Design a protein around this nucleic acid. Structure first.
Ligand code: NA
Length: 211
RNA sequence: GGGAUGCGUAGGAUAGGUGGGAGCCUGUGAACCCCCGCCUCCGGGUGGGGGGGAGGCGCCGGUGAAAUACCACCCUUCCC
């Protein structure tokens, strides 16, 4: 059965039965061919009501920007010298941001470590930039990545199940819209083949993405 | 359509992809034992039955490109 977003938002209350505050997910089977590089969906979006989770942000910057990342609220901040701390297996954070001037050292020394974990700072994921305080403030306000897997599916967290239905409904549209804004011009056919709403431990519920 | 299947090497060992995840399961019967179906890369995996009677599993750690439970969306090959 196909539910509306407003319907699905309200059902999270009932789907969420684990003994913790479950994250609310959105999944979509995408209308692309993920083989071809030009059909890749990748980008970020500021959820209008936040993730509702605290995100330990590390910032590796240079010069004044180290002060900027500090004041933007990044949990740990340092120069190229915290590379050697991750080289020793520190790795206690959720997201790495970085200014372009350090990405030469960061890439070559931590690419092989941060890369496979989707933690490498990357322009395409909104994690590299001299606007490093806006990146941190955008993350801390609940910006999320989304990047199709090779199977052509795509997934994103869009809230906690403790949120009011109407706020979850908002976050779901916002992410749905941001998907459609990254619909590759080469992608033929229906873009959002299917779209489901679920919680971490809970069952799925297919939704009407234009509702 | 229905049913399964998912193992280079390193690693408890059979890690399809990715996202979520700090919890999941269990007297409405856990580990463990036996019997049978199927699958098998011959390591094992998996379904069912009987016994059993309170503990399994994850997180952590280590290994690894990636980490284990659990959940979701997909993908694969196979049988009917
Ligand atoms: Na683990």
């Amino acid at each position: 059965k196909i539910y509306t977003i407003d319907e699905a938002a309200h059902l999270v209350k009932e789907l969420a039965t684990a003994k913790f505050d479950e994250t609310v997910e959105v999944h979509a089977k995408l209308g692309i061919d993920p083989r071809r590089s030009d059909q890749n969906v990748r980008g970020t979006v500021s959820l209008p009501h936040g993730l509702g989770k605290q995100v330990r942000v590390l910032a590796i910057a240079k010069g004044e920007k180290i002060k900027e990342a500090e004041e933007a609220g990044a949990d740990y901040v340092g120069g190229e010298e915290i590379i050697q701390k991750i080289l020793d297996g520190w790795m206690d954070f959720d997201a790495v941001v970085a200014t372009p001037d350090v990405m030469g050292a960061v890439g070559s020394k931590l690419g092989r470590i941060l890369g496979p974990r989707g933690l490498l700072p990357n322009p395409k994921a909104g994690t590299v930039g001299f606007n490093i305080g806006e990146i941190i403030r955008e993350i801390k306000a609940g910006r999320i990545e989304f990047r199709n897997d090779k199977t052509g599916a795509i997934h994103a967290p869009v809230g906690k199940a403790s949120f009011p239905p109407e706020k979850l409904a908002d976050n779901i549209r916002a992410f749905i819209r941001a998907l459609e804004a990254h619909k590759p011009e080469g992608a033929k056919g229906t873009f959002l083949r299917s779209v489901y709403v679920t919680t971490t431990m809970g069952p799925s519920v297919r939704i009407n993405p234009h509702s």
